[PDB]
Amino acid sequence: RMQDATDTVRGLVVELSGLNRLIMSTHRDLEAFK
Amino acid sequence: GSMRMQDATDTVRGLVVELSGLNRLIMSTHRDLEAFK
Amino acid sequence: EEFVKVRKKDLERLTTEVMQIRDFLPRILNGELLESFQKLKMVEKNLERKEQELEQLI
Amino acid sequence: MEEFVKVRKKDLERLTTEVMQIRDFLPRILNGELLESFQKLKMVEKNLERKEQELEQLIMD
Secondary structure (H helix, E strand, O other), X not given: OOEEOHHHHHHHHXXXXXXXXXXXXHHHHHHHHO | OOOOOEEOHHHHHHHHHHHHHHHHHXXXXXXXXXXXX | OOEEEXXXXXXXXXXXXXXXXXXXXXXXXXXXXXXXXXXXXXXXXXHHHHHHHHHOOO | OOOEEEEEHHHHHXXXXXXXXXXXXXXXXXOXXXXXXXXXXXXXXXHHHHHHHHHHHOOOO
8 A cells, every 4th residue: 555645745834834934024024124 | 546646756856956955055054154153 | 636646765855855944944044134134234323423423522 | 666655736736835935035035145244243343342442542521
């Protein structure tokens, strides 16, 4: 039986989604300063 | 069975390359700031 | 909600790279970047102020 | 052969989307401008220190 790695991938999406929030908020902070 | 799954391995391989390069940028930038501060 | 297949080792590589971003990105992207930009504008204005102050005194 | 695992197609598409957004925006923060700002801050701090020490050593009142 082929293993189902869907839940692993869903966890990576949650992780990268949070990292993208941090990137966007940091970028907008530096954008607003200058 | 008669129906088979699409192989998305090459897509994943491209993502690995993308993220590997982003990690190179993170590590180099972090070390630059580390070396100065 | 169909499935695709991926070589197990390649998905393992992807997980490793994602976890490295998790590990180190917050050690750069934090409040210290904006703080550095703000402090620089503050000290620059204080320098120019004290430069003119010393000029009017000597 | 090397073993396969299976993943719901739509969840892999989401992962791709998130990876590409990092690609798009991370280099617009991580570049030489961060280090340059820290280097510039340390330089002006020393020049302000040396300008305050000149005012402190001056007898003017």
